[PDB]
Design a protein around this ligand. Structure first.
Ligand code: SF4
Lengths: 26, 132, 1006, 375
């Protein structure tokens, strides 16, 4: 019931840009 | 294949309603970014029922078990998010350099609908503290 | 001896070079006039010089040097200069040189190539300053091996040392005036510098990172582990090679661009196995022909590992791409420099060893936070989540590339343009050796015979005081809290008396202008007079402070040039024996104090030494000239800054070359800054060619005297807080006259900060050398005398707050530690604190980073101390509850303490290491640096101090933890940071579990 | 204050797309016919683009390592009261929001040149009775009108019509087509002969009068120069605008030069003088135009400095080193302006063209010309 929390990431990371396919949307 | 973005409803609502004043748009929207993983229970229907009535920390609304996971208090640009009994997050309301836009892909009818456009975000970049 | 082997190596290197596009270019014969001013007539080819190496060349071999060039036309070539090696013999009896000649005639049965009589200056010899010269025999030889055999032949006689680290390439580069980074037309007569091209050409730049297999919980070991990926970047285009016997899926093409400034489009080469990956890598290198290859700590990890796997698959990397380990175990090629950025990081970045990881350099210098992944999850993910692992690999390669391109490349290449070395050497030598090399250049060009390397035995503790440090007050000081000042009225009296001349000096010396042209002298002078008189009346005052820092611009170099300090000026049992003396009246020689320190019982004795004002100026001329060229580039920088903004905004309109120019002059001025600052430390190094302990003493004592004079003034007019070597942090009363701006006739304004000008005026009153002489007519030995002084305080600030710690010891402060904050609340400097110290709890770092800023809240002393009391009570609630108010997962992560072992196991770390020895084998700890992760547990009770680090990562935890120990640890930190300065500021103990001892009360007026 | 709640199941249809200022201007425009449309050539392989009515952006998803929760405001169906915990700084609840989505990525838009997907579009050479031929072949793909083509193409309407006109697209007997090079220029030649034969205003041409002029004395069943063909030739070799066409005369001369190269001098390196004479003689009488060989730069090469020979850019390799190898095989020493339009296609980095040349081969100058030798 009190088992909700955030596992802190030490630093902000932004991942690599990826191409998008039609299946990526659906 | 190809499909249009339907943005007529959001546009009509935007022109007929005033400019965005606070962090929440007139249609009632907010985003949130956390540097981490929000560790939540894997099940909810079973666990929402054992929560005592006084706490109401796991409520039921229209057949859906919603978890009351925190509270938000906005003091000017400063903002604080209380999570559970043991977490406190300090953050800020920042104006987006690039106005984000939420959309919606209706797979059923192959229709795309513009839901809304953001201009602000509430960010929390520091390690969570106890609620005190 | 190894002649024929060196010829074999030369021919192999020639084959490598030709395969990679460096054919030997031999320019056409041209019988005409070697002239340097006209260039366009002479037949030949213009090229930008990028490397040079000693070599031996065939028609017995002939010594020479290969120079590797790029050109204005996008191509490359190499060309070779030949030069006879030589060294000199000095005789102690000139009259019988013919007998010595006969001796060596016998000693050098076959080694000798030629001989010749020459004359050089010897600065140890009486009357050398009046033109008496030393006669020397120049002895020439075919190669370095013959030199080394000659030295071996001469050593028994000396038993019954000279030129041993004079690199051959250095000797030719100096004598020929050649520098990497400069442009030359290569001709038969030699190299003619093209002064028209200054902007660098653009080399092919390769940066690379490997990902390897390793066993669980151990380090990669190159005898058995394999490469799973190699990522690299070449001039902004990414490549990734994969070993699909191990990486369990094909990686697809992707973009990684962590800032818009840094684009990364990566093309993928999924290769079937390890050998194919190697062949694709080497083949790609051959395809693109890099002349820089960069790594991060590749000399200790990447390269030997690659070598051993290469050998394991029967490939010869030297044969494939020409890289091989040298005698130091470092990886070098002929045609491509290996720029391991870690060397630059360690030497030049100015960062503590705790921040020498890729992460901290990336965040500090490139300004963003890269992706991080635990190695234990990295190996399974190779199979299970290959995209994430591949994101890590390319992030590594991007960071290394842009770190190199933005910082290391301009810096190293600009350093090569004044120092006679190739990039590898300029990267790796001590700063003392670079200084040595510059002075050797200056000496050669002024025909000065170089002294031999000092060899005298090491007065066991020769470790004299280098700088003076004082903690004067501890506490928080803030612009919104009032402080007590006690003004010495006789200081204001001195200031008022000195004021007209102090302002005249400000106008004419500080600003290099003339009082003649000042519009507002009397107005300003009345305004200041009124402020000083007001301060004079109410001289016991309590008001808000001005937090200033004042710091002499380039302290030790300016002390050196002002006092004309150089090693040859030290008397050494004789001066004025043959040169005239009454012209400064004090027999020419200017006596200055240094502090001698013997340790035997320890004793310091003040001593004095004479600095000749007529001695040959080559050292100090290098310093003055170097200082002016750096100032030149700071100026050019500013002009360029104006050019980068004056113009139009079409960024791509042939003005990105101008930005390259900007970057370039930036690099040259910072390169002069670092070389300039290496001149103090050079004079104390072991084996220095210009060793002088006395010179270092003179510099340090002079600076200490200047800075104490400044201390005596500030102490009479304000409150100094902390002093370290060449800097003073102080507070002045708000009523003190501060900043004004004189208006010039052109309408411009000149800035005046009066505390700074009053100090510089006093420095010029007390420490000007009025005896600086210079040859006005060298043929007749006519000297001219004048006054030199380039020592100036400058001011930074005002600041919002300062926080200073106190020692645990009675009547003692802590040196090398303080915190200072800018007006906006940001951190300007942190020295000494646990963040920097080996071994600390991340929680404590998070604590200190929280607490420092909270002293700027509140409007009163009591309110600020109440606020820190409240945070103390917050921490007491977390610690008094033994961690119960805390999730079980967040705590265990947070338990790491990190410690470097500076040596090998063969301290608290040591026992852990020993136990690590027991656990993972002693070979694991045969090298330094294993995983030293520990917590101090309450149990077992009575364990020894050296047992305190227990390996715990292997492991009711809340009852295991010794919370009282950590509260004591926090108490210790709190003692240093909060409670003891509070006590010194008369505030009673906000953390009662650490009690105020009696002595600290006694310390203050109580 | 607002109470934050979370549902057990999020809708993954909601995704975040970055909106640049220009996108915002586009978004707030009710005037547009088509506002925005996601387009892709296929479902599994090709890239996805976002198109407005006149511009095209390619989409790129960018993953991030954070937890991003979007909350929408909701009105609880039944009054709900929450207990107070040791929480400080709490105002009375006035509305309620629920995190309904958890997004891990954004969709960035980068401007790119829209191109037509000409997969199933056949080539028309002016064959008689072509309707029969479209069933002589088995083309399942149907394209009745051009709007349907544009709808299924990754481009905007204006880009589509411009590219379609540029490649000489047409429609014959109700079937969409692409004209062959030969028959298109032949139709141009006959049209110009008829236009100057009837002294028409070449700057104010309309479809009807020219179409009538071309097919005046030929049978309709065997007259392929239909009205649609006329619209294509006008939209290809003229500019329209009550909109009329005016001829692009230097462009026509350039096209004509390309035609001459492909028909007559594609196998031998003729001296330039004789080729200019024959070239000049091929035009319809009194056509106003001057000539220089640089108006065919990028379509020819020079075996020696005073001769010319045709080369088609389509036959050149896509590997850089190979294409440069074959270029140097055709000409050891090149003039810079001759080789520049030939290398434009290899790398879009926007650098100085000389740097582009400096990856493999090397430059060497002389008096005015700069040539390139792979050493
Ligand atoms: S002090 Fe002056 S006079 Fe004496 S030796 Fe030196 S230069 Fe000569």
């Amino acid at each position: 019931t009190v088992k909700i929390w955030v596992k802190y990431n030490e630093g902000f990371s932004n991942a690599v840009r990826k191409n998008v396919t039609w299946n990526n949307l659906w | 294949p190809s499909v249009d973005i339907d943005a007529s409803q959001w546009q009509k609502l935007t022109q007929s309603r005033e400019k965005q004043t606070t962090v929440i748009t007139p249609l009632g929207m907010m985003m949130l970014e956390i540097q981490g993983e929000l560790e939540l229970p894997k099940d909810f229907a079973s666990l929402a029922r054992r929560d005592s009535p006084n706490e109401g920390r796991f409520s039921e609304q229209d057949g859906e078990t919603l978890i009351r996971f925190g509270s938000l208090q906005i003091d000017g640009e400063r903002a604080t998010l209380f999570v559970g009994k043991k977490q406190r997050l300090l953050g800020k309301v920042t104006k987006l350099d690039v106005p984000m836009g939420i959309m919606h892909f209706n797979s059923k009818d192959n229709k795309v609908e513009l839901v809304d456009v953001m201009k602000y975000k509430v960010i929390f970049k520091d390690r969570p503290l106890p609620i005190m | 001896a190894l002649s024929a082997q060196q010829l074999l190596n030369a021919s192999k290197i020639d084959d490598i070079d030709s395969m990679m596009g460096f054919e030997r270019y031999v320019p056409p014969q041209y019988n005409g006039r070697f002239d340097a001013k006209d260039i366009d007539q002479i037949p030949g080819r213009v090229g930008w010089l990028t490397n040079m190496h000693a070599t031996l060349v065939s028609q017995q071999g002939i010594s020479g040097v290969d120079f590797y060039f790029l050109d204005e036309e996008g191509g490359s070539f190499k060309s070779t200069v030949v030069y006879d090696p030589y060294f000199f013999i000095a005789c102690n009896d000139e009259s019988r040189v013919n007998d010595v000649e006969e001796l060596v005639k016998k000693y050098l049965e076959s080694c000798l190539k030629s001989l010749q009589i020459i004359r050089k200056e010897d600065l140890t010899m009486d009357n050398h300053l009046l033109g008496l010269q030393k006669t020397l025999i120049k002895l020439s030889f075919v190669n370095s091996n013959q030199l080394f055999e000659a030295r071996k032949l001469l050593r028994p006689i000396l038993q019954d040392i000279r030129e041993y680290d004079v690199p051959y390439h250095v000797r030719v580069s100096i004598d020929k005036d050649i520098r990497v980074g400069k442009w030359y037309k290569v001709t038969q007569q030699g190299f003619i510098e093209d002064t028209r091209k200054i902007a660098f050409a653009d080399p092919v730049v390769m940066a690379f990172a490997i990902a390897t297999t390793k066993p669980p919980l151990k380090f990669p070991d190159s005898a058995v582990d394999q490469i799973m990926m190699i990522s690299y970047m070449i001039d902004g285009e990414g490549f990734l090679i994969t070993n699909r016997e191990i990486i369990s899926e094909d990686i697809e093409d992707f973009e990684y661009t962590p800032k818009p400034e840094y684009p990364g489009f990566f093309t993928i080469f999924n290769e079937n196995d390890e050998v194919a990956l190697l062949q694709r890598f080497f083949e790609h290198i051959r395809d693109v022909r890099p002349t820089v290859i960069s790594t991060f700590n590749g000399d200790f990890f990447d390269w030997p590992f690659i070598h051993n796997r290469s050998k394991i698959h029967g490939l010869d990397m030297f044969d494939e791409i020409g890289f091989a380990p040298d005698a130091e175990g470092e990886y070098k090629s002929s045609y491509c420099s290996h720029m391991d950025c870690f060397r630059w990081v360690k030497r030049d970045s100015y960062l503590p060893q705790g921040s020498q990881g890729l992460k901290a350099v990336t965040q500090s210098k490139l300004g963003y936070n890269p992706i991080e992944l635990d190695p234990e999850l990295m190996t399974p993910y190779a199979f299970e989540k290959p995209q994430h692992l591949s994101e890590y690999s390319v992030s590594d390669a991007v960071a290394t590339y842009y770190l190199y391109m933005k910082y290391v490349h301009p810096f190293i290449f600009s350093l090569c343009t004044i120092i006679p070395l190739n990039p590898d050497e300029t990267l790796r030598k001590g700063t003392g050796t670079l200084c040595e090399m510059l002075l050797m250049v200056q000496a050669y060009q002024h025909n000065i015979l170089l002294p031999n390397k000092h060899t005298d035995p090491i007065l066991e503790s020769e470790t004299y005081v280098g700088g003076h440090v004082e903690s004067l007050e501890a506490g928080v000081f803030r612009s919104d809290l009032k402080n007590e000042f006690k003004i010495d009225p006789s200081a204001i009296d001195e200031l008022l008396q000195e004021l007209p001349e102090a302002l005249k000096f400000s106008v004419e010396v500080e600003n290099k202008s003339s009082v003649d042209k000042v519009t507002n002298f009397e107005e300003i002078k009345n305004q200041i007079t009124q402020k000083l008189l007001e301060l004079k009346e109410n001289n016991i005052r309590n008001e808000l402070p001005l937090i200033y820092h004042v710091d002499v611009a380039s302290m030790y170099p300016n002390i050196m040039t002002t006092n004309r300090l150089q090693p040859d000026s030290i008397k050494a049992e004789r001066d004025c024996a043959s040169c005239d003396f009454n012209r400064p009246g004090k027999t020419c020689a200017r006596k200055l104090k240094w502090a001698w320190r013997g340790e035997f019982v320890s004793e310091i004795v003040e001593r004095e030494a004479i600095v000749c004002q007529r001695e040959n100026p080559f050292y100090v001329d290098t310093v003055k000239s170097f200082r002016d060229r750096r100032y030149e580039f700071k100026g050019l920088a500013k002009t360029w800054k104006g050019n980068l903004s004056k113009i139009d905004p079409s960024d791509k309109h042939a003005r990105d070359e101008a930005k390259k120019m900007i970057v370039l002059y930036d690099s040259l001025q910072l390169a002069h800054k670092v070389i300039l600052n290496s001149f103090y430390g050079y004079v104390m190094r072991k084996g220095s060619r210009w060793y002088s302990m006395e010179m270092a003493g003179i510099t340090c004592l002079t600076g200490a005297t200047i800075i104490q004079m400044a201390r005596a003034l500030v102490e009479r007019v304000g409150r100094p807080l902390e002093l370290d070597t060449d800097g003073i942090w102080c507070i002045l009363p708000k009523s003190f006259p501060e900043t004004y701006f004189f208006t010039l006739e052109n309408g411009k304004k000149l800035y005046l900060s009066y505390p700074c000008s009053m100090l510089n005026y006093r420095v010029h009153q007390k420490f000007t050398n009025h005896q600086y002489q210079e040859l006005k007519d060298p043929l007749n030995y006519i000297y001219e005398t004048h006054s030199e002084n380039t020592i100036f305080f400058e001011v930074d600030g005002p600041y919002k707050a300062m926080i200073l710690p106190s020692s645990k010891e009675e009547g003692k402060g802590i040196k090398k530690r303080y915190a200072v904050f800018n007006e906006d609340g940001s951190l300007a400097e942190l020295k000494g604190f646990e963040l920097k110290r080996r071994g600390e709890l991340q929680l404590i770092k998070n604590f200190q980073s929280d607490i420092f800023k909270v002293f700027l809240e509140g409007d009163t002393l009591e309110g600020c101390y109440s606020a820190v009391a409240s945070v103390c009570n917050r921490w007491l609630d977390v610690l008094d509850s033994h961690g119960l108010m805390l999730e079980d997962e967040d705590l265990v992560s947070l338990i790491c303490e990190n410690r470097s072992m500076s040596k090998t196991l063969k301290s608290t770390s040591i026992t852990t290491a020993r136990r690590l020895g027991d656990f993972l084998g002693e070979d694991m700890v045969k090298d330094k640096g294993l995983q030293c992760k520990y917590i101090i547990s309450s149990k077992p009770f009575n364990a020894p101090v050296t047992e305190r680090a227990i390996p715990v990562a292997i492991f009711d935890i809340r009852t295991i933890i010794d919370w009282g120990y950590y509260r004591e640890r926090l108490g210790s930190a709190i003692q240093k940071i909060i409670t003891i300065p509070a006590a010194l500021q008369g505030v009673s103990n906000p953390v009662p579990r650490v009690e105020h001892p009696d002595w600290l009360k006694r310390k203050i007026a109580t | 204050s607002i109470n934050l709640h979370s549902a057990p199941e999020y809708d993954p249809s909601y995704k975040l797309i970055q909106l640049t200022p220009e996108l915002l201007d586009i978004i707030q425009d009710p005037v547009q016919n088509h506002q925005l449309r996601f387009k892709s050539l296929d479902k599994d392989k090709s890239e996805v683009v976002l198109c407005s009515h006149d511009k095209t952006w390619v989409l790129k998803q960018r993953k991030h390592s954070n937890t991003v929760l979007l909350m929408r405001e909701f009105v609880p169906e039944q009054p709900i009261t929450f207990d107070e915990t040791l929480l400080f700084g709490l105002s009375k609840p006035y509305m309620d929001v629920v995190g309904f989505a958890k997004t891990e990525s954004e969709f960035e838009t980068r401007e790119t040149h829209g191109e037509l997907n000409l997969n199933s579009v056949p080539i028309y050479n002016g064959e008689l009775d072509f309707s029969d031929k479209i069933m002589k072949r088995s083309s399942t793909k149907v394209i009745g009108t051009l709007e349907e083509l544009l709808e299924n193409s990754p481009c905007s309407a204006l880009e589509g019509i411009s590219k379609w006109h540029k490649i000489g697209g047409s429609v014959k007997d109700g079937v969409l087509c692409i004209l062959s090079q030969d028959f298109l220029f032949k139709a141009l030649h006959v049209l110009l002969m008829s236009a100057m034969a009837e002294s028409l205003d070449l700057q104010h041409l309309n479809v009807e009068d020219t179409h009538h002029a071309v097919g005046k004395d030929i049978e309709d069943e065997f007259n392929p120069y239909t009205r649609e063909i006329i619209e294509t030739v006008l939209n290809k070799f003229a500019v329209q605008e009550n909109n009329t066409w005016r001829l692009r005369i230097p462009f026509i001369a350039q096209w004509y030069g390309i035609q001459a190269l492909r028909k007559y001098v594609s196998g031998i390196s003729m001296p330039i003088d004789e080729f200019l004479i024959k070239w000049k003689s091929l035009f319809p009488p009194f056509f106003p135009c001057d000539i220089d060989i640089d108006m065919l730069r990028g379509y020819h090469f020079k075996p020696t400095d005073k001769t010319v020979q045709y080369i088609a850019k389509s036959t050149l390799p896509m590997d850089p080193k190979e294409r440069f190898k074959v270029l140097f095989r055709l000409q050891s020493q090149w003039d810079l302006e001759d080789i520049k339009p030939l290398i434009e296609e290899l790398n879009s980095r926007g650098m100085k063209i000389d740097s582009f040349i400096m990856k493999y081969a090397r430059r060497k100058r002389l008096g005015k010309k700069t040539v390139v030798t792979s050493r």
